[PDB]
Design a protein around this nucleic acid. Structure first.
Lengths: 135, 131
RNA sequence: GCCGUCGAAGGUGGGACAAAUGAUUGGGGUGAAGUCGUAACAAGGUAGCCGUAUCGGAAGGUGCGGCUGGAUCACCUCCUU
RNA sequence: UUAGCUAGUUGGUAAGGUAACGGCUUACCAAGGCAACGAUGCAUAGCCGACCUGAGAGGGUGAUCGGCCACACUGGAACUGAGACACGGUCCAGACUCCUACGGGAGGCAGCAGUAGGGAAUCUUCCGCAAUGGGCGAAAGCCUGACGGAGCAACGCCGCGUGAGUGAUGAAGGUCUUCGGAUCGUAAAACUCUGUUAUUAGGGAAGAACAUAUGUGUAAGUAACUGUGCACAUCUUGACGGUACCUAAUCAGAAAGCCACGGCUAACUACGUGCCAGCAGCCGCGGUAAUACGUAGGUGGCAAGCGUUAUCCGGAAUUAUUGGGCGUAAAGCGCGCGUAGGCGGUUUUUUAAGUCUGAUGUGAAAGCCCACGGCUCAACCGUGGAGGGUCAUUGGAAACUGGAAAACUUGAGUGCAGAAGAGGAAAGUGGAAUUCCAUGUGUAGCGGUGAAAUGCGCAGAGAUAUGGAGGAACACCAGUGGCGAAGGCGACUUUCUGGUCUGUAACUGACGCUGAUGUGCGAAAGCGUGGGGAUCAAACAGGAUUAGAUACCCUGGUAGUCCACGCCGUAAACGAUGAGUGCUAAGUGUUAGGGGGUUUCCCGCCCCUUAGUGCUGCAGCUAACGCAUUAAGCACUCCGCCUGGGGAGUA
């Protein structure tokens, strides 16, 4: 627009939003507010492990899990890899990243850091899914 | 009400390029005569001829065209326009098209082409590029 | 040492604001090949759309004013070799 | 979607008080002050040199390092002292913890560690003042969790070797094979040198170390180098650390993996599997022959690191000043009057604020960049340079912007002659059509559908003929035709009232344009108040079609459509095109004018000029369609607006 019309307003932007809406963690304890603590990953206790299916055109029994996090929030995250060593009351570390199966789940746990043990059924992607180098 | 006479003259010049007519008519001004003279001195204007009638102007100029009827410049515009006036130092003065084009600039001592303005180490308010 | 002013903390009172909560409740996004009807997309089988009003389970309808972003036909008048 | 805030506030007087000026505090007088150029509030946040990114403008951050500020369990206060209202000082109040003879008393790790708890996650409860720097002392010397140094983490950067050469037989073996062979592959084995690094023995125990006091000798002062105050000599000081590093000897022996291989993007084969398991950053793979799942081989990238995740920038021109758009894609509000603001016709003189230009001071240092030097090189460090201000002072210039003064008319406005127009308000008038009623004539029908049915009709319909009453809009005229800023304006006559153009050019001499906020007008529908209702017509009734139709269909039918005054204040309010100004090929018309020639007379004809009002079209422009003097072209100023869809005009 005209230069003076641009002087008397700060040329506002289209500020983005987050992709991990629980990248944030509220105040742990001794407080009621929710801190803006940022993290690349959060631990959490899993209160149920379940399994659901994606929408069309994919068809598969995809395995997910709802987890209570340190910030006392409720999220969902699907377990990757072959075999899952989790159940209700199991603590687990969680990463961030969305899947296109169905919404309501946009994370996925990390295999081998927490109770969730790595599966040694793999030999190619070993540095993921917790597999250790075999000999 | 006309906001800017330089805009008028440059629009007249470009609109004379798009149809190619040797003669054009435009109310003159002292800055207009000076910049027309510098245009002739670069080589873009075949001839200059001021006239007088009630009251100002009206500056009549004779355009220039190549043997194959080719327009000399490939574009022409101003930089200093109202609202956002602009200025230029001696070292910071821009080399548009280097030698190819020139940069009309008004200085404390008068309006000159881009060159002399950087030679004398005196800048000023630019008016219009041409190339 | 006594008295006087200031004085925090504390108590009392009334308001303001924020967040959780709450029986129920309203609307929305989504999911099975759910059912009902098919208004809109063509002259969509009653042209559509815009606002308002009103009716109706509902898509919607109707009335009033407007637009073409309407077609079979056809512009008063006008343009075109 | 934070609009009023402030009463010691603002100003004064007087005094007190403070190192100081000051409503800093008191008493008196006054009512001002702050705020659209964003006060106040709310929410968040220490700031900066810089760091990261980017070509650049910019964007994000405030970790080390240095500067400034604020704080020391929470709140209040003050003594000392130059300096504190005090981090390891005091008193009180408050919370916590703890001892006690129960009477009362002791502390504040956001200091170093170290410990708990929280978190995804962040470390010794180290040696020592050898150096630098602190506090004190006359000094020696003291003290100093500053700091020097050591140590832990691949946390980061950089570098580093995991051997070299010769070596084919294409060895074996693995993989694939169209069963020939090919792949790994000089790769391996082996031969010869090597030791990166390591292991041993030695040295060096290297530098950083300079010194203070101590004796010789010298200058200033005193009567007195008697003694004192000043420079040399020689004596004397290492936690790091027996380091670093170096000498000689020995071995390829201790030292390599991770991701990816469909495209993006460099790198394919077999098998398993068969919409299952799974992959997935996107496009998307897989339901029996998956180069995309898993595995094997091979290959590519990278490396003592590699991949994932989160965050930031770029890409992203996807906030567009450099560097965006608004016909149709999101984006011109409905329009009008206009404040503040932004912008500004022509010429002269003048000022020199902006601008340009030179100097001066300053922009700490470290950092970025450049150049060089030193740690074996690099990393790093040092040196020096440049660079860095929207910086202040001051010397000059005056084209341009700006200030002042003086001239002009071409913009705008006025003036004199004209032109037209459904332009607005109030009233009345004329006739038809319609409706109702009445009468005469007159019969079996009238009415309606595609077919009907409903309804009306023997109380004589309809209709015909006449006359009368009602309410409601005005037949041709009517046209792409005009007026009006849009929404609008078509009956006539008058009264009052607003606008537009042409010519004129005498006249005022820039008085202009855009224009947030504010104000008013604003379709129809809807509403308040009272009438009128002839028609027409939401809701509604009947019938008909229809599987069903409360819809379309037919017959009625209320509100409503009408008037008068208020109310509301949207619309596909459009030309999906903001207003103002200037320029750029044409032809063809239309509405209200003007100049000229042709005619005895132009009224008959033509040319030229206006302004709107259209079309076809060139240049150019556009996603294309289309725009084209009535630009969506060529530019300028100003305003409005958009930054994916749904959510949603929703809360």
């Amino acid at each position: 627009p005209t230069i003076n019309q641009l002087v008397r307003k700060p040329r506002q932007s289209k500020i983005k939003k987050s992709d991990s809406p629980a990248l944030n963690k509220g105040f742990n304890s001794k407080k009621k507010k929710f801190t803006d603590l940022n993290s690349p990953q959060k631990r959490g206790v899993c209160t149920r492990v379940g399994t659901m299916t994606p929408r069309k055109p994919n068809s598969a029994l995809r395995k997910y899990a709802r987890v209570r996090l340190s910030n006392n929030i409720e999220i969902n995250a699907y377990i990757p890899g072959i075999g899952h060593n989790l159940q209700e009351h199991s603590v687990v570390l969680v990463r961030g990243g969305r899947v296109r199966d169905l919404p309501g789940v946009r994370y996925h746990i990390v295999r081998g850091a927490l109770d969730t043990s790595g599966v040694d059924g793999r030999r190619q992607g070993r540095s993921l899914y917790g597999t250790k180098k075999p000999k | 009400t006309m906001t800017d006479p330089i805009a008028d003259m440059l629009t007249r010049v470009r609109n004379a390029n798009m149809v190619r007519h040797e003669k054009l008519e435009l109310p003159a001004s002292n800055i207009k005569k000076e910049i027309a003279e510098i245009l002739k001195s670069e080589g873009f204007i075949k001839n200059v001829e001021y006239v007088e009638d009630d009251k100002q102007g009206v500056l009549r100029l004779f355009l220039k065209y190549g043997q194959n009827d080719e327009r000399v410049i490939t574009g022409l515009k101003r930089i200093s326009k109202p609202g956002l006036r602009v200025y230029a130092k001696a070292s910071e003065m821009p080399k548009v098209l280097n030698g190819l084009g020139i940069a009309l600039v008004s200085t404390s001592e008068g309006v000159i082409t881009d060159k002399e303005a950087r030679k004398r180490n005196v800048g000023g308010e630019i008016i219009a590029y041409v190339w």
